[PDB]
Symmetry: C2
Subunit: 151 residues, 2 copies
């Protein structure tokens, strides 16, 4: 599961508020970000974002994606790239591989995520503000119970 799936195998998440996406079952090991870029968009990136607590400490965890074209991006939920502890209104990189793995274990059980578009630029390399206006749609799915059975 890192090849995009056929339509009937896509369990789409439902988009809410400050870009929350909510699913009817645990996210599991793979999510897929489907992007239709605007016709003058040269580049975009952003993340799926999670927050978790472990023994009284709070963490923000982000998986970064990017594209230069309409495409489906496979996100491996075992491989976060930004992990930070939120200590009051301050943050601190987490590098401890035990903490990271526990966070990912927990994230694999979550039913929702944050979808954010961070940065976008047009075909001349000039910034598109807000980044959001650079895409025509962004959606997120996970595989169906049936696709997962195929191991």
């Amino acid at each position: 599961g890192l090849a995009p799936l056929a339509d009937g195998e896509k369990l789409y998440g439902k988009k809410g508020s400050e870009g929350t996406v909510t699913f009817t079952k645990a996210i599991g090991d793979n999510a897929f970000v489907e992007i239709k870029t605007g016709a003058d968009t040269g580049f975009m990136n952003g993340c799926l974002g999670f927050s978790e607590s472990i023994d009284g400490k709070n963490y923000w965890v982000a998986y970064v994606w990017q594209t230069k074209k309409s495409d489906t991006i496979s996100i491996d939920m075992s491989s976060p790239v930004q992990i930070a502890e939120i200590i009051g209104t301050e943050t601190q990189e987490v590098t401890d591989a035990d903490t990271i793995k526990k966070l990912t274990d927990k994230i694999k059980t979550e039913k929702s995520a944050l979808l954010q578009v961070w940065y976008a630029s047009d075909k001349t390399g000039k910034q598109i503000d807000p980044a959001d206006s650079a895409s025509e749609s962004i959606e997120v799915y996970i595989p169906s119970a049936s696709a997962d059975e195929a191991l």
Copy 2:
């Protein structure tokens, strides 16, 4: 000399949580939060992305609250600065880079408002975090007010 009111230029809320204004954000932004009734704690951020000498950065100002409040946010004092390198990130501590970034940010007209974490009055996580608030707005000061 606090405070307010009616000279609060609010920003319109977009989709992915973007919030946009009719003029540059400037030095201070105020996150206006109304907490939901079983909520003991919320945090999240205002975020921005900037490019500089063809590098891409993500910059975040974190707020938190334990109640209905207005958090003043200092645009000069971000707390999470990463350079985005492909699908990886790299923390920024260079003081000049931060300085350039904050300079650019202050001239933006839009920002990303995000709720990250939220907890019950029994420290029981609320999910999605967003659900723990009854209402979250941002304003900046009116240009009448700014002249003062």
